[PDB]
Amino acid sequence: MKYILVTGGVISGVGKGVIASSFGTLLKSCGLDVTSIKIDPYINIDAGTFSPYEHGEVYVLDDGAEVDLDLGNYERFLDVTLHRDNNITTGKIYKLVIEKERTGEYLGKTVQVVPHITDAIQEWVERVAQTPVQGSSKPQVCIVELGGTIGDIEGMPFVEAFRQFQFRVKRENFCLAHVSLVPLPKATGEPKTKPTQSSVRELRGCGLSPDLIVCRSEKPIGLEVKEKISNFCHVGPDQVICIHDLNSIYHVPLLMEQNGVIEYLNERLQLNIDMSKRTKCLQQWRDLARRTETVRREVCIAVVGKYTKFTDSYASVVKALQHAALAVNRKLELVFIESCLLEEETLHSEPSKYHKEWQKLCDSHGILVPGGFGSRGMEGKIRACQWARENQKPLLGICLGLQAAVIEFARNKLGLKDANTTEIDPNTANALVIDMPEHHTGQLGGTMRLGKRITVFSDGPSVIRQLYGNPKSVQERHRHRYEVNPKYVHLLEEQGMRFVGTDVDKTRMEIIELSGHPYFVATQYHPEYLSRPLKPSPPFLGLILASVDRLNQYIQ
Amino acid sequence: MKYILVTGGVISGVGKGVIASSFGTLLKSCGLDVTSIKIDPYINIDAGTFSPYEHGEVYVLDDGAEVDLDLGNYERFLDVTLHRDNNITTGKIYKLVIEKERTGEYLGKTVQVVPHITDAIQEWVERVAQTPVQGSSKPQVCIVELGGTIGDIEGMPFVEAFRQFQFRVKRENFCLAHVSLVPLPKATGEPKTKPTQSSVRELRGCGLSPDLIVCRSEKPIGLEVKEKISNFCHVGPDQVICIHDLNSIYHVPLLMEQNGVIEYLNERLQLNIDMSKRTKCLQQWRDLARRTETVRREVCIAVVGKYTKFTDSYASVVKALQHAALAVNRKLELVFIESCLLEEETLHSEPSKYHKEWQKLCDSHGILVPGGFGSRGMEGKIRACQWARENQKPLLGICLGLQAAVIEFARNKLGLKDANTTEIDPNTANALVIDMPEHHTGQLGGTMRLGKRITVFSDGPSVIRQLYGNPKSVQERHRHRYEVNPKYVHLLEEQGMRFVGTDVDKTRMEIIELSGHPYFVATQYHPEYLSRPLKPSPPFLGLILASVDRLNQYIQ
Amino acid sequence: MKYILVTGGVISGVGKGVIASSFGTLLKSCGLDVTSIKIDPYINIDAGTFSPYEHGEVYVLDDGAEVDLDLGNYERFLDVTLHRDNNITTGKIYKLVIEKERTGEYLGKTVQVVPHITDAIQEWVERVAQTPVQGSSKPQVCIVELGGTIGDIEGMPFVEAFRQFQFRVKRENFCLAHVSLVPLPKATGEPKTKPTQSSVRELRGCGLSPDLIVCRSEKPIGLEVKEKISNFCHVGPDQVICIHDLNSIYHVPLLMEQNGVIEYLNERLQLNIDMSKRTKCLQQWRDLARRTETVRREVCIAVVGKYTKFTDSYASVVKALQHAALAVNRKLELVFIESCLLEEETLHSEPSKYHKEWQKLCDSHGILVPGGFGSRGMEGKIRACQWARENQKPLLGICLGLQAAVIEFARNKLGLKDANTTEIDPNTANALVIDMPEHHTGQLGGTMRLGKRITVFSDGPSVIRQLYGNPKSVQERHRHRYEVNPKYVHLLEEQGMRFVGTDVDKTRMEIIELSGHPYFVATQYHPEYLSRPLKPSPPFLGLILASVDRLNQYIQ
Numbered sequence A, B, C: 001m002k003y004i005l006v007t008g009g010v011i012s013g014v015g016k017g018v019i020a021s022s023f024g025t026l027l028k029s030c031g032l033d034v035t036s037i038k039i040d041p042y043i044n045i046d047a048g049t050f051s052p053y054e055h056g057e058v059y060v061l062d063d064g065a066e067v068d069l070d071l072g073n074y075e076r077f078l079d080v081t082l083h084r085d086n087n088i089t090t091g092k093i094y095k096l097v098i099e100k101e102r103t104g105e106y107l108g109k110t111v112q113v114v115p116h117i118t119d120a121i122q123e124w125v126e127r128v129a130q131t132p133v134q135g136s137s138k139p140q141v142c143i144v145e146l147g148g149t150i151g152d153i154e155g156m157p158f159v160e161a162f163r164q165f166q167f168r169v170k171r172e173n174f175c176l177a178h179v180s181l182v183p184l185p186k187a188t189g190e191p192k193t194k195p196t197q198s199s200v201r202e203l204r205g206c207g208l209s210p211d212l213i214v215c216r217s218e219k220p221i222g223l224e225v226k227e228k229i230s231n232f233c234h235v236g237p238d239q240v241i242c243i244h245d246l247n248s249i250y251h252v253p254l255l256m257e258q259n260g261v262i263e264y265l266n267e268r269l270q271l272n273i274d275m276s277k278r279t280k281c282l283q284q285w286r287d288l289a290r291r292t293e294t295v296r297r298e299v300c301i302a303v304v305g306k307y308t309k310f311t312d313s314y315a316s317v318v319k320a321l322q323h324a325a326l327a328v329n330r331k332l333e334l335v336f337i338e339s340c341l342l343e344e345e346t347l348h349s350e351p352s353k354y355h356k357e358w359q360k361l362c363d364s365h366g367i368l369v370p371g372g373f374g375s376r377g378m379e380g381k382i383r384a385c386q387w388a389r390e391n392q393k394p395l396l397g398i399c400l401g402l403q404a405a406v407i408e409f410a411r412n413k414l415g416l417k418d419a420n421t422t423e424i425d426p427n428t429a430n431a432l433v434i435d436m437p438e439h440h441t442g443q444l445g446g447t448m449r450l451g452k453r454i455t456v457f458s459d460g461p462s463v464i465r466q467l468y469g470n471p472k473s474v475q476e477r478h479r480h481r482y483e484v485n486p487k488y489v490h491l492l493e494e495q496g497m498r499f500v501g502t503d504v505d506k507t508r509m510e511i512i513e514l515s516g517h518p519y520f521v522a523t524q525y526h527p528e529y530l531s532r533p534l535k536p537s538p539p540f541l542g543l544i545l546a547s548v549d550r551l552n553q554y555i556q
């Protein structure tokens, strides 16, 4: 088994995830089987209790585990089905070791960090690396990404464990790629190599040595900077790879190939990769990059989301929208709209921003209402849903968007002006959205309806059923804790809406649709987690087609 | 609240525990209330699963917690009743934080080490420091001892937490004493200050600074060495305290007083200790040190123990024996005898060692059989018990010694040659000692009969009942997992033995005695944990008096 | 005496020099006397042997010492006359200590780094801080700038020396300001505090602690970033000062004042600065900043220099040009022109660049030919001088510019097509510029005509004599090693040129002028080193006035 370790330089947003995903893509292009392990030095057992601002959107796996978006990147670039054990956190290791000690496995000796925690980390890595991830495939290469930067107090156990690991499995099976930042201050005007030198010195003090130095900058650096880095890092001139800011992340594998990363890894790790056959290996990615470069027609989708201030809080959403837009030869113009600024309270505070956001929402061909938590920005989601339903603008709501759509429908069409969710208004006369009884045991974190489920399509002609391929039932991943009230659904269905998606029990409904309006579809689950570059999610594809006025043509 | 931190230098056997206990003794002599917190950077929840070789004898607290011998030193020098929360381990903090995160206390943000683990450590220290420990007394000074040495990967969270703590509570409430070793190699022939300089440099790199430098050596160091340490550690000449190897640990408080530690701490910590009243404060300790220096009459006790290779594995037993010997103006000659070398197997392997150990056992005025775990050396305990019972040599057995005495009595007097414990021989025809059903749930660590219990004295004249003061029932601390079989006890009592100690249910017997032999007493509990310098344990005092042929005189 | 230490963060171009100069300006506005010491951890005795690319333009002091441009910034912002001892290098300290040891001052003991090198550094700082620098003024505050970044192997002696120094002079006399960089990567899109945290951790490990944290960024950072820095650096919220990229360096003192730096330093260093009187203190700098903001009229000067790739290689030149431009209410449009691209060889290689640079040179109102070393780009200087003399474009040549002008004059007007300098063509038939015999002893570094000298104005009406104020002789600083041949000067003076500047011996001529051409002045010395914000250099002022066609009006 061969291992690649990707460590961090001076910042944690440097791009380790993209580098590791590109390593996996290159190694799978050759023909190998690649595993991916994400190491999160934080103590949370899972990521189900994170704000989207802290590290980005929270991914939901197939078994219900909530993990980082790095696992989403791994699944998107590698088309593999990861498990709960592909994410390693400090809390997991410490809980495991504490339980083992309490049971009596370590009887006689004291449990320490270096002999016991590091041993548990190494055993976890070795056991997970061999776990099949694409079916019956036996993996050949494991890519481990260390979250954070070198020098943190949280990463010390992991760097010590890998310092022992490189000798446990010999140097021919272990490689280490270091990703660093090369700032180019405007006032100074020249690229600076000092932070990279400090990072390399810290990594050498920790007992490791970078086989590769990936220098990340905004613009290509000169040969003087690269030579300086090679001299002051004790690394070969051809062992330093310069990756600058590219148009899309699809160019990163191509950039690393043109920098000869595959050849260096094949000689360094003894992968026995033959050069003759591996020609035109990245044809799918080259075609995708060319299509991203050569899309002229414009499609505009407005995202009424409450996590707009950070652009990576809707990573999977943006990626699914991009996949759908590329699948129809359209250039996705994404306008992020804070749902808070669409509320009437903003009008009494910042009229200019309110009008600017409303006119941004009014000039878009489509609207998307993703999920979220809390009560802030939910009224703006209601207002956007109301406007879209009134003016026949196509809209796609996800999780919280479905609840907002139901609230708007009940408040306007049914006249129940007091309709609200128990999440926001527990004392509601007409609790349109209520709580699922078995997911409020007072223990936040891994206690909702999580993972794959089964959604039953109702008996009746619905275009959303067509969009998926006219099936009887479909499977998707859920991240919801509240559900709509059955009794009002009986009323809402009669008036103007069609609940066309439910579960086997026909008690938990998931998909709503309306007669009249061309495309007004809301989902309780997240269709975005199953989107791949060549497999755009059918809901997003339908939203794009309706936005560009091509849905009817695609139907026939 | 005032805090004193005692950190380690180049070795962990340097003497931090004695220094902290002496600090507590000095501060309690002035009149203050002193708490003690022991920080163990290991991950074990408690010390119930430690070998005696790793750190020494394992102490049992009043509530059942098994802790380090440092807590025993604290209770012996301070006469306080510590609790489970006076020991801090890495496992405790990590388990606490993991449970808090899982419940939902840290919702929204990732749990890290510096903002969360260190905060939990500081909250634990602040909450435990204020917990009453001598009754209704509100503590004034907390003495925290950091286990290990500065620079360990395990101690990094604690040193970071205390680096923040010194500024959280201001420098006037926080003091740091550093204990270092000054080696004097025979070949080199001169004291070396370099290890102390390296330790000080590491401590300053960690963000702390030693208010005191305690230099530990075997012989007093010259003024040149002390001046060198003061110059190269950036510490004042009078701020370095030299403690050498003394006859007894009772001299350490006196040595630190004659080095002016109390005055420096009073000025540095603003303790407002008045100089005029505090005269003749350490009169008990000065008297005890003089008595240790001026004991001429000789008493010899042989310890048939399996943990002889390390002299600190019987710390509490040795201290109780010393207290009893000093209470009768006798000098305790302690000869440690490995019970393995008293077995007939050693005779066929090392006859010289077998004869040497047997003649060491034969020239002693008394024998002590302490407790232990495992099957190694148990046959030697049986042989020693048999010889003592045959030749009328006084003997005191503790825990495993009681089971050994029962086994010997059944095998010899009752003729049951197959008598054995289930701990060693589960397939026994006559299981003289069996297992308690409720303490084998397959979870080692805090699952025995632990802590204070109640022992009922049987209705009948027994000298052990007198030795305690002729009570009806007494309370002691238990660390046993196996108990003797009731049915054979009915036979054993009839033949020659008197089971004079049981529990309230009259089903778990604890103390044995036999007619004839002057002093042959065995206990299921540990009497040594309740011994104090002015309160010797009555069993040990009786053993000493019987050894020196003074028990009959003391009776009347 | 009070000391301020300015240390470096993650890069050495962060702006420590501007921060220290602004500290000095603020402290001198209050009324104190401020010294400045620049510490260069390199081993060069002086900066006379540096490339302009390594750290920038090399400054020449009054006594002949060649120092860094930081001393030029100190003299420009403080209007003080520094000495050779205001620059501390590693070579200086080590040479001093080695000479002392060889003489016998350290007899008996070995000379080490911590007790001896650091002691020499501290003695140097203490002795130089008290040296008068503005006349008879006794200094009150010394500002020490540490070159480089914290963590370098070269800076370890100096950081150790200052760690002892802060306790030698007590904390009330010592303050430490840390300047760090806060990158905002385009891909990541958010400011990053991790490099600042790492720098603070390294500085705390070195034994120091930043009283101030100056965060340098390109755009103002949000309050979240500042709060994160305050939390993770253990520094107060108001102790973090954010300085972003400003229009001119004159805004930095005003920015630090509006951030309340003066008040914090007055309370921290006990400067006893009264608040009531110090009103409108920075009126000169506020007026200068407003004038820099409010200059509309355009003046264009082309710099034909060979060190164009780095914009700081002509720091003093650009500053003198800016002072002259501001003194006439004109906005200086500076176009840097590589003299290499003006050569005919570039025409045969890159015709586009050759034509672009020639048309950049042709659209400027004036030309400046600064000094330099080597032969590269000298032919381009000749071509630019020839074009300017032919087309009546005003030109100012410095040092090498005077030699280029003489070469062009001899080659064209006198017809000596083989005229060249001995510096470039030692085997010259007509050596127009030759070597000074006493400055080629084979020892590069402090061996030229350096420091202040005396220049004698020739008997005859010359406009350059007027520009200075019609004196008889003037004093300037020299950095030249070659001088023109006297015999050809006799011929050139007759033809069309007037050598109007010589020395007392009337053998070393310094200033040339030509009849006809409005403004063609060349100087052997550097007038730029004596330029101050309110005292623009008369040569640069005359060049600007001739460029904007106002010289004749200014004459009368």
Ligand SMILES: Nc1nc2c(ncn2[C@H]2C[C@H](O)[C@@H](COP(=O)(O)OP(=O)(O)OP(=O)(O)O)O2)c(=O)[nH]1
Binding pocket: A048, A049, A050, A051, A052, A372, A373, A374, A375, A376, A444, A445, A481, B107, B108, B109
């Ligand atoms: N608010 C909330 N968060 C949950 C819940 N279950 C899991 N989580 C996670 C999602 C959220 O990203 C995170 C809470 O952090 P935040 O306070 O930032 O959530 P929220 O989106 O409501 O932001 P906000 O407080 O409204 O500004 O915990 C839940 O039941 N309620």
Ligand SMILES: Nc1nc2c(ncn2[C@H]2C[C@H](O)[C@@H](COP(=O)(O)OP(=O)(O)OP(=O)(O)O)O2)c(=O)[nH]1
Binding pocket: A107, A108, A109, B048, B049, B050, B051, B052, B372, B373, B374, B375, B376, B444, B445, B481
């Ligand atoms: N053997 C044993 N140890 C226990 C038990 N419960 C708690 N402990 C602790 C006491 C022991 O000091 C420690 C085990 O470490 P050791 O192997 O050194 O114990 P032991 O005294 O038997 O030494 P030995 O293996 O015979 O050389 O676990 C138990 O039921 N059996």
Ligand SMILES: Nc1nc2c(ncn2[C@H]2C[C@H](O)[C@@H](COP(=O)(O)OP(=O)(O)OP(=O)(O)O)O2)c(=O)[nH]1
Binding pocket: C048, C049, C050, C051, C052, C372, C373, C374, C375, C376, C444, C445, C481
């Ligand atoms: N070439 C040269 N440099 C000197 C002399 N005396 C002092 N110095 C300094 C100035 C220069 O900046 C430095 C030499 O470094 P460089 O090679 O970069 O100088 P130069 O301007 O000629 O650059 P170049 O080699 O032409 O690309 O030494 C001298 O006599 N000749």
Ligand SMILES: Nc1ncnc2c1ncn2[C@H]1C[C@H](O)[C@@H](COP(=O)(O)OP(=O)(O)O)O1
Binding pocket: A012, A013, A014, A015, A016, A017, A018, A019, A070, A243, A244, A245, A246, A247, A248, A249, A252, A312, C187, C188
């Ligand atoms: N070479 C590159 N060019 C352009 N964008 C990049 C890039 N590498 C990464 N990115 C983008 C993708 C991510 O959203 C962000 C960096 O985060 P990341 O790639 O997940 O790394 P990390 O896991 O270290 O944060 O910037």
Ligand SMILES: Nc1ncnc2c1ncn2[C@H]1C[C@H](O)[C@@H](COP(=O)(O)OP(=O)(O)O)O1
Binding pocket: B012, B013, B014, B015, B016, B017, B018, B019, B070, B243, B244, B245, B246, B247, B248, B249, B252, B312
């Ligand atoms: N000053 C002194 N003189 C003689 N013996 C000492 C001493 N200080 C400590 N000792 C003994 C008592 C202990 O058994 C051993 C050191 O261990 P300790 O005092 O518990 O410190 P630590 O907790 O650092 O191991 O040596």
Ligand SMILES: Nc1ncnc2c1ncn2[C@H]1C[C@H](O)[C@@H](COP(=O)(O)OP(=O)(O)O)O1
Binding pocket: A187, A188, C012, C013, C014, C015, C016, C017, C018, C019, C070, C243, C244, C245, C246, C247, C248, C249, C252, C312
């Ligand atoms: N706050 C600020 N805004 C704009 N430019 C600045 C600035 N501070 C410094 N600069 C410019 C001036 C210098 O040429 C360069 C930084 O170099 P410097 O100020 O001499 O510091 P250092 O000595 O650390 O290199 O950037």
Ligand SMILES: [Mg+2]
Binding pocket: A012, A013, A055
């Ligand atoms: Mg990340």
Ligand SMILES: [Mg+2]
Binding pocket: A016, A017, A018, A070, A145
């Ligand atoms: Mg990542």
Ligand SMILES: [Mg+2]
Binding pocket: A054
């Ligand atoms: Mg962050």
Ligand SMILES: [Mg+2]
Binding pocket: A374
């Ligand atoms: Mg919330």
Ligand SMILES: [Mg+2]
Binding pocket: B012, B013, B055
């Ligand atoms: Mg110990």
Ligand SMILES: [Mg+2]
Binding pocket: B016, B017, B018, B070, B145
């Ligand atoms: Mg101890």
Ligand SMILES: [Mg+2]
Binding pocket: B054
């Ligand atoms: Mg040990």
Ligand SMILES: [Mg+2]
Binding pocket: B374
């Ligand atoms: Mg065992």
Ligand SMILES: [Mg+2]
Binding pocket: C012, C013, C055
């Ligand atoms: Mg500089």
Ligand SMILES: [Mg+2]
Binding pocket: C016, C017, C018, C070, C145
């Ligand atoms: Mg500088």
